[PDB]
Structure formats: C-alpha cells, structure tokens
Amino acid sequence: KETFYITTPIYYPSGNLHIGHAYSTVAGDVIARYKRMQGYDVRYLTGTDEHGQKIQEKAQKAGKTEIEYLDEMIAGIKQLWAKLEISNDDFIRTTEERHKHVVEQVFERLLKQGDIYLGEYEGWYSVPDETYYTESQLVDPQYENGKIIGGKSPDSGHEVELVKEESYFFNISKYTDRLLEFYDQNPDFIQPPSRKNEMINNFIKPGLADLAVSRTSFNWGVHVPSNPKHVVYVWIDALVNYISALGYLSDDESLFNKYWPADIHLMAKEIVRFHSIIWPILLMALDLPLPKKVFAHGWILMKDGKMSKSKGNVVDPNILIDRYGLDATRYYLMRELPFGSDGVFTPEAFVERTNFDLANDLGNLVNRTISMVNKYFDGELPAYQGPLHELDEEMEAMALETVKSYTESMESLQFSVALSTVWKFISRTNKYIDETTPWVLAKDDSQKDMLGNVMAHLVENIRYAAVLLRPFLTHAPKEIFEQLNINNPQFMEFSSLEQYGVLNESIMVTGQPKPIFP
Numbered sequence: 001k002e003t004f005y006i007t008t009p010i011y012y013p014s015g016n017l018h019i020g021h022a023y024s025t026v027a028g029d030v031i032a033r034y035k036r037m038q039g040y041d042v043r044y045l046t047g048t049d050e051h052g053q054k055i056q057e058k059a060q061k062a063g064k065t066e067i068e069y070l071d072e073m074i075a076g077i078k079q080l081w082a083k084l085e086i087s088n089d090d091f092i093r094t095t096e097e098r099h100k101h102v103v104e105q106v107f108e109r110l111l112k113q114g115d116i117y118l119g120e121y122e123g124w125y126s127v128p129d130e131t132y133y134t135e136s137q138l139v140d141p142q143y144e145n146g147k148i149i150g151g152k153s154p155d156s157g158h159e160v161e162l163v164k165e166e167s168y169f170f171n172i173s174k175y176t177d178r179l180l181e182f183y184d185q186n187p188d189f190i191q192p193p194s195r196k197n198e199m200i201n202n203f204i205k206p207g208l209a210d211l212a213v214s215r216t217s218f219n220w221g222v223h224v225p226s227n228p229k230h231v232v233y234v235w236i237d238a239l240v241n242y243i244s245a246l247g248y249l250s251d252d253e254s255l256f257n258k259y260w261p262a263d264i265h266l267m268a269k270e271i272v273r274f275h276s277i278i279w280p281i282l283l284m285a286l287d288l289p290l291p292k293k294v295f296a297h298g299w300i301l302m303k304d305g306k307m308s309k310s311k312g313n314v315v316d317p318n319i320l321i322d323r324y325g326l327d328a329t330r331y332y333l334m335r336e337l338p339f340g341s342d343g344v345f346t347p348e349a350f351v352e353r354t355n356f357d358l359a360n361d362l363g364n365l366v367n368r369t370i371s372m373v374n375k376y377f378d379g380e381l382p383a384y385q386g387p388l389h390e391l392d393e394e395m396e397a398m399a400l401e402t403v404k405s406y407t408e409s410m411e412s413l414q415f416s417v418a419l420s421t422v423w424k425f426i427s428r429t430n431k432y433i434d435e436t437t438p439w440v441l442a443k444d445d446s447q448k449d450m451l452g453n454v455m456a457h458l459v460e461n462i463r464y465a466a467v468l469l470r471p472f473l474t475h476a477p478k479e480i481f482e483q484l485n486i487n488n489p490q491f492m493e494f495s496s497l498e499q500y501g502v503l504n505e506s507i508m509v510t511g512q513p514k515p516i517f518p
C-alpha cells in the first residue's frame with residue numbers, strides 16, 4: 001500500500017475552537033477518508049500547541065496550573081473532534097514527553113552543530129500571536145522623540161511588548177539562497193501558488209533575520225537541557241509535532257521512515273510563513289526531507305473580519321451540529337467556503353445549504369425514488385439490465401464523468417467544486433424523474449420493463465452520489481444504503497463506480513422510508 005501523511009495545525013487551546021478550526025480539521029478528515037477509500041495507507045495527525053506565555057497567562061488568569069487548564073481545554077477540543085467524527089489516527093500534545101524529548105534533542109543537536117548561538121533579543125513581541133515583530137511591522141505605532149516606543153501586532157491588533165532578554169538565536173539567514181533555490185525547483189510547494197509571492201516579498205526580501213528560538217523571562221515550555229533557564233520558542237516546539245508524533249529520534253523510527261515526509265500540511269494563510277520558511281530551514285539544518293506540499297486555505301469571515309477565538313466574533317460548531325446535525329455542518333464548511341479564497345459565514349447561507357442542497361435536492365431524490373419503488377413494484381426494485389431508456393446512455397456517461405471530474409477537484413483540495421459537481425448529478429437525477437414521468441409508465445404492463453429500468457437508474461445514480469459523499473458526510477451515505485437495502489460493502493467503494501449498473505439482482509428496498517436528513 002502507498003502511504004499518505006496529512007496534518008492540521010496543532011491549535012492553541014487558549015479558548016473555545018470555532019468553525020475556522022472545524023474547517024481545517026474537517027478538510028483534513030475529508031482528504032484522509034478520500035485517501036483511505038483510494039486504497040492508501042493513511043496517517044492523519046492533529047493536536048494542541050500548549051507551551052508559551054499565551055497559554056501560561058490564560059492558566060494564571062483562570063487561577064489554575066497550566067496542566068489543569070490544558071487538560072480541561074483539550075477535553076473540550078477532543079469532544080468536538082469526536083462529535084465532528086474526525087478520523088485522525090493520533091492526537092499530539094506538546095506537553096507529552098514523546099514530543100518534549102524530541103524538541104530537547106533537536107535544540108541540543110543544532111547547538112552542537114553551531115546553528116544556534118547565545119545572544120540577546122531586543123525588539124517587539126506579541127504574546128497573543130507568539131510572533132516577533134520589527135518596529136516597521138507595528139500598526140498604530142507610538143512615536144516619542146522620533147522613535148517607535150510602542151504599537152499593535154499587524155496580525156491580531158493586540159498591543160506588543162518590548163522584549164530585552166538573553167535568547168538563543170538560530171542562524172536561518174545562511175539558508176536563504178538554499179530556500180530560494182528550493183522555491184525555484186519546487187514552484188508548486190505552497191497551494192494555492194498565489195500565496196507564495198506575498199510571503200517571499202514580506203518575509204525573505206527584507207532579509208531573513210536570525211530567529212530568537214529561546215526565552216529566559218518565563219518558564220512555560222521545553223527547557224534547553226544544556227541551559228535549563230532557557231525555554232524553547234513555542235513555534236520551534238510546535239513545528240516539531242509533525243515528526244515527534246512519528247517517533248523521530250526514538251529507538252524505533254518505523255512510523256517516521258514510513259510516513260515522513262508529509263504529503264500535505266493543512267493551515268490557514270496567516271501561519272504559511274512558519275511552515276514555508278522556518279520549518280523547511282529547520283528540516284535542512286536536521287538534514288531531513290521537506291514536506292511535499294503546504295495547502296493554505298482562506299479565513300472564514302464575520303461582518304467584523306476574520307473569525308478569531310481571542311476576539312469572540314465566532315460561530316460555535318457545537319451549536320450548528322446540535323441544532324442542524326453533523327452532515328449539514330460538515331457539508332456547509334466544505335461547500336460554502338472554497339479552499340482557495342476567504343468566505344463570510346451567514347446563518348441564512350447555512351440554512352439555504354442545509355435545506356435546499358441536503359433536505360430538498362438529495363433528501364427528496366431518495367424519498368421520491370423509494371416511494372415509487374414501493375408504489376409500483378411493492379418494494380422489489382427491478383435489477384439493472386442496460387440503458388433501455390433513450391436518456392440512459394448519456395446519463396450513465398454523466399455518472400462516469402461526475403466521478404472523473406470529482407477526482408480532479410479532490411486531488412487539488414477543491415472541496416467546494418467536487419461537491420458542486422456531485423450536486424449537478426443529483427439535480428440531473430431529480431430531472432430524470434421529471435423527464436421519464438414514470439407514473440405514465442405505471443399505467444400499461446407493456447411499459448413495466450421500462451418503468452423498472454427508470455427505477456434501476458434512479459437507485460444506481462443515488463448509489464454513485466452516496467459513495468462520492470462518504471468522505472464528506474458520515475451519516476447520509478450509510479442511511480441511504482440501509483433504506484435502499486444495498487448491503488454489499490463493495491457497492492459502497494470507489495471501484496464499484498468504474499462500471500454503471502452493479503445491482504443486477506432485484507432488491508427489496510425499505511417499506512418504511514425515513515427522512516435522510518437531518
């Protein structure tokens with residue numbers, strides 16, 4: 001079996017996760033499930049970014065130890081992934097020894113190699129962004145005798161603080177030409193490629209400054225073994241999760257050798273710089289292969305901009321699932337919000353997706369079909385014979401073309417296009433009923449064969465849609481197979497879509513049709 005390794009960002013458990021976090025984790029889940037159905041040996045990693053002042057200050061404010069705070073927050077996150085039915089193969093916490101020990105080895109190795117040297121970081125820092133800023137990067141900067149003496153982060157808009165402490169530096173500047181050479185040789189590395197140029201212009205052109213990779217002013221993080229008063233910079237700590245979770249630097253590196261390098265790192269656009277500059281340079285310094293692709297999706301937006309945990313301008317996925325069901329929540333996120341751009345959430349757009357696409361187009365397609373099979377054939381769906389109706393040959397071709405087009409969208413992580421292409425077919429299947437007017441055929445017994453043929457095409461079309469939706473919807477496909485009494489597990493797999501009309505034996509469909517949705 002060919003291997004496929006996909007990761008989400010490990011999220012800061014600094015508050016309740018929102019549909020932004022759900023998008024990343026569902027998107028990763030869809031690709032994992034898709035890749036498993038394609039016959040790949042899949043590992044899907046998610047986790048939590050638990051070190052740094054951002055978390056430590058949240059714990060102290062809550063009046064709790066960092067670890068009690070974190071266990072309570074991680075509990076909330078793991079409840080959400082369970083409810084969203086995320087098929088992640090592992091959950092990595094940066095507070096785990098399997099992670100901390102790898103971060104220790106990596107730092108000690110880069111110190112020994114001389115990539116890391118002791119200095120002092122004197123400059124601006126955003127605790128909420130866990131990001132170093134130059135004075136020119138600050139928004140609403142404050143001037144005093146012609147000097148910038150304060151300002152806000154350009155990312156979060158939180159006030160930055162002045163840092164002046166002993167710090168270990170990683171000489172990332174000497175890897176600049178090698179990184180630019182890598183981009184020249186691998187121009188498809190960031191997807192979509194429209195994110196690459198802004199990142200090079202913003203972060204490499206001005207000159208790769210040496211990265212402050214340790215702190216002495218607080219103690220919540222991995223301690224530098226050779227200099228324990230130093231704590232590893234949360235972003236060095238965090239990035240290592242992708243290889244630490246595979247048992248890199250452990251006795252048995254079988255998981256590492258099998259799944260590294262990662263096929264896809266998922267993220268939103270704001271942390272591309274960490275995954276596209278610092279991460280590849282760190283991997284160069286450790287002499288490890290680079291990730292194959294960074295897939296950076298857009299932001300889910302509200303009326304007041306990017307949906308943000310710290311801001312509070314949020315939509316809780318727990319509310320959406322409890323109120324409208326899981327299928328509607330997963331469908332909305334993947335369909336309404338194209339991967340390669342930003343998208344505004346509205347409750348109106350959510351209910352329209354939920355009611356018109358799921359309940360009406362798909363839900364009513366299944367109900368119409370089973371109702372007619374029960375009415376005309378007393379529940380005995382006649383076996384597929386061939387394209388007996390003059391519309392069938394062309395529709396059977398559309399079924400195959402839907403699978404082909406769907407595949408092309410899925411391989412480029414164009415989830416919204418894959419789903420749009422499936423719904424074009426679901427719409428055409430509904431239109432097949434309107435065109436064939438099977439109620440007219442039910443009159444004479446001379447048309448009983450053709451009526452059977454129409455029923456067999458409706459059901460095979462539904463089966464195609466159900467199989468293609470298995471990565472996206474975890475409830476609807478199983479419910480559809482149950483109600484149609486399709487029990488062959490092979491007829492739920494991608495290979496069964498290779499030739500139209502697999503149901504060549506008669507089937508008793510459910511005598512008690514229930515709504516597929518919610």
Ligand SMILES: Nc1ncnc2c1ncn2[C@@H]1O[C@H](COP(=O)(O)OP(=O)(O)OP(=O)(O)O)[C@@H](O)[C@H]1O
Pocket residue numbers: 009011012013014019020021023024128129156266267268269270271298299300301306307308309310311
């Ligand atoms: N608005 C959003 N749209 C899409 N994905 C998002 C959004 N917000 C967060 N994410 C996902 O979570 C990642 C950022 O993780 P993080 O824990 O920093 O969330 P946050 O809401 O931006 O945090 P905070 O508001 O506390 O700064 C993104 O890279 C993406 O994977």
Ligand SMILES: [NH3+][C@H]1C[C@@H]1c1ccccc1
Pocket residue numbers: 008009010011012049235238239240241271274
């Ligand atoms: N904003 C931080 C969550 C993202 C992250 C950093 C490094 C590795 C994985 C995830």
